[PDB]
Structure 1
Amino acid sequence: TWRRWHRRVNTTQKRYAICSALAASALPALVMSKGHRIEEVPELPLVVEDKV
């Protein structure tokens, strides 16, 4: 049971990866290459009002 199942990652690297994922989510080619069927979405950084 003491296989060392868990890994610790640097906080700065985890924040770096979050920033990279967010930046990639705003590019239509990458979101399309994830196969997300965005061909009629009006604007890729899709923002809606707070009423949602």
Structure 2
Amino acid sequence: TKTWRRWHRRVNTTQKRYAICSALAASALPALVMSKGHRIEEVPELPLVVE
């Protein structure tokens, strides 16, 4: 094994921004959040906003 193996990957900035938008949109759907096992019950609103 050699140290000059490719360890690092570069992703396009537009694709990285795309992934964040998709992650944010999914975080507002309670079905997807419960499918992560996040125990969102008794939570008043899934897009929880506090002062």
Q: Whole-Å Cα distance in 2 between the matches of residues 2 and 42 of structure 1?
A: 51
Displacement after TM superposition at 1:42 (Å): 0.2
Matched residues, percent identical? Answer: 100
* TM-score w.r.t. length of structure 1: 0.93
Equivalences, count: 49
**Which deviations, in whole Å up to 9, do the C-alpha atoms of 1:6-48 show, x marking residues without a partner?**
0000000000000000000000000000000001100000000
* TM-score w.r.t. length of structure 2: 0.95
Runs of 4+ residues deviating >2 angstroms? none
Within the candidate set 20, 23, 29, 1:21 is matched to 23
SS across alignment from 1:29: helix
SS across alignment from 2:44: coil
- Rg comparison, structure with higher value: 2
Q: Give the aligned CA root-mean-square deviation in angstroms.
A: 0.3
